[PDB]
């Protein structure tokens, strides 16, 4: 039994924290939003994969200083608040705790590492999951859920890193989730970028969810062209993606229930979009490697313009 | 004194027809929309260049068959209705009449020529003008107005073509308008594409007019990148554009009053967008020449998706 801290309990942190708690883990949730609703009513999950689950009462906190020291810290906040997140992580971390960033984008761990003690293990978890907040304290899980974990930084030699990644994967597999130990975290992040870069931004720009985007020949063609830009950029930066990865991802999204990506909800509620991690960082890495992504570049420009308007 | 027929009296046909009529020309207007409002109240112009002008009564018609034979036919309709326009043009044309397409896009005359007798002269007129319909029968002219004319097809040898283009330019110059006889109609159309391709589509996609688009660093950078794609495509198809044409066009739009391109109004009223002439035709010409325009291609895809939605 591990003591798990969830720093940022949105849809992502709520889902994985509840799943771990239901597998018998000791999970402590840090709430910045919905603290009293959740500490009242608890945490509920409607899931087309796992059925209905409820956590009540929940070990809930409004302040990281009140949390007990945790051996694993799952970070489910958006990448936009990661700077402000570091003191909360340090406060809740037991000595040698493992920090797992259940976050999308590129370069996330690298930008957080300067703010975390080198005695902490820093890992990324790429979640392929259709999940969003419903009513307060209610998580709506539509499909998937698997987590690809990888190691970024920490006081672990090269054998120990593989061991720690497996320990993390086993946590999720023990909870009934698909989980894979990745050899290369950056390669894993490029894999997830091929999905988030087209679908997150186009859902905002075209005011659409996955099903209309895939039913229309023109948006389907645009999504595939953007995918090939990310695949190319990754190759230019030294990362091989699997053969025919674009059709592989396109087919999974046709199978996918009609889904609004997180960035769609962010723009719908006036929250800041995750542009820095999902677009700016890959574009800069692609530029430094001499590789141009014209469609992604223009999509990023369009999203920055939309964010600056009324 | 020429007898002028205006086939399609929107903002563009209304403006140039009224200006010609005010210079003493005998102008006959074909109205598909606002016929009874215009035949009632007449045609009014609020213009920051020419001041207020009114045409009342107007020689108005609901049917091309009622029009007298005209020596010049000014076509101010959108490019979307050009197929249906041909019988109206043939009906209103005097023998050897000149047909002048005051329309944007590429390949417009080529697609209309099969539907017009070869005894008619077919010309294009590229209008650089900020104009839109206000209240019914009222034209709102914000800036510019110049017309670059060029010859496409007709029963005229090579000397006569220059003469006819000059005759047309003189018509507009005699009415107080800037007008230039172009040696090459297709080159002139590529020139105007550098403005319409970015600004028309981005105004729809970003729900914005020219001033916010130019005030924002990201949209300004995107507009310039799109301009360079069109300049490159034109060069690939064998047409040289003037040196630094992009900055030349960008500076004119900074000077320009806040302006909603025609395509913005089209999408706002549920009218079909001019995608075929402004995007599809240049993209196909660029493809046939081995030149790729990734941003324009993606912009075109986005606009086709938006048109197919609710
Ligand atoms: C299956 C991919 C899923 C939609 C996801 O993980 C995301 O929204 O980023
Ligand atoms: C000056 C360019 C003007 C805005 C125009 O001609 C158009 O809308 O197509």
């Amino acid at each position: 039994q591990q003591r798990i801290g969830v720093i940022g309990t949105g849809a992502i942190g709520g889902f994985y924290g509840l799943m771990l708690a239901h597998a018998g883990h000791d999970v402590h949730f840090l709430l910045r939003s919905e603290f009293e609703a959740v500490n009242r009513a608890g945490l509920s999950l409607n899931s087309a994969v796992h059925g209905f689950r409820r956590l009540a009462p929940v070990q809930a906190y409004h302040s990281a200083q009140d949390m007990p020291p945790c051996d694993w810290l799952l970070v489910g906040a958006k990448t936009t608040g990661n700077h402000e997140l570091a003191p909360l992580i340090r406060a809740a971390a037991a000595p040698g705790a493992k920090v797992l960033l259940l976050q999308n984008g590129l370069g996330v761990e690298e930008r957080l590492r300067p703010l975390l003690p080198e005695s902490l293990h820093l890992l990324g978890g790429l979640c392929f999951i259709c999940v969003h907040r419903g009513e307060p304290g209610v998580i709506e899980h539509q499909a998937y859920g698997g987590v690809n974990l990888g190691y970024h930084s920490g006081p672990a030699d090269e054998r120990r890193r593989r061991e720690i990644v497996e320990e993390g994967a086993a946590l999720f597999r023990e909870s009934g989730l698909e989980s894979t130990a990745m050899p290369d975290l950056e390669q894993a992040r490029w894999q997830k970028l091929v999905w988030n870069i087209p679908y997150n931004g186009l859902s905002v720009l075209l005011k659409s969810s996955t099903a209309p985007l895939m039913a229309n020949a023109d948006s389907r063609s645009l999504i595939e062209a953007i995918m090939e830009e990310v695949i190319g950029a990754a190759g230019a930066c030294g990362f091989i993606l699997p053969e025919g990865y674009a059709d592989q991802l396109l087919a999974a999204t046709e199978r996918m229930p009609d889904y609004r990506p997180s960035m769609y909800h962010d723009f719908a509620h006036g929250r800041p979009l995750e542009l820095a991690a999902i677009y700016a960082a890959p574009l800069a890495r692609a530029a430094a490697a001499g590789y141009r992504m014209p469609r992604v570049e223009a999509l990023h420009q369009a999203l920055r313009f939309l964010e600056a308007q009324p």
Side-chain angles (χ1 to χ4, degrees), chain A residues 8 18 69 93 101 106 121 170 193 200 206 237 248 257 264 306 309:
Chain A
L18 177 146
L101 304 193
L106 193 76
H121 306 273
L193 279 182
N200 285 48
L206 304 187
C237 295
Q248 206 181 297
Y264 179 108
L306 297 176
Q309 297 317 294

Side-chain angles (χ1 to χ4, degrees), chain A residues 104 127-130 144 192 195-196 256 259:
Chain A
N104 296 310
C127 313
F128 299 73
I129 178 177
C130 297
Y144 295 119
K192 188 66 193 310
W195 195 97
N196 283 132
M256 179 179 307
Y259 174 72

Side-chain angles (χ1 to χ4, degrees), chain A residues 53 95 130 132 140 185 190 230 258 265 288:
Chain A
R53 306 248 186 111
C130 297
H132 63 93
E140 299 286 338
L185 176 62
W190 276 105
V230 193
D258 199 10
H265 296 294

Side-chain angles (χ1 to χ4, degrees), chain A residues 17-31:
Chain A
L18 177 146
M19 291 299 288
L20 284 175
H22 270 243
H25 288 296
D26 186 31
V27 184
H28 302 255
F29 295 82
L30 177 63
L31 289 320

Side-chain angles (χ1 to χ4, degrees), chain A residues 32-34 41 57 75 78-79 84 96 100 115 147 149 154 212 223 257 263 293 299 301:
Chain A
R32 44 176 160 56
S33 189
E34 334 303 328
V75 174
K78 297 310 216 320
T79 52
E84 301 66 38
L100 176 58
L115 313 181
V147 178
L149 289 88
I223 291 160
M263 186 171 297
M293 316 175 65
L299 176 52
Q301 280 156 346

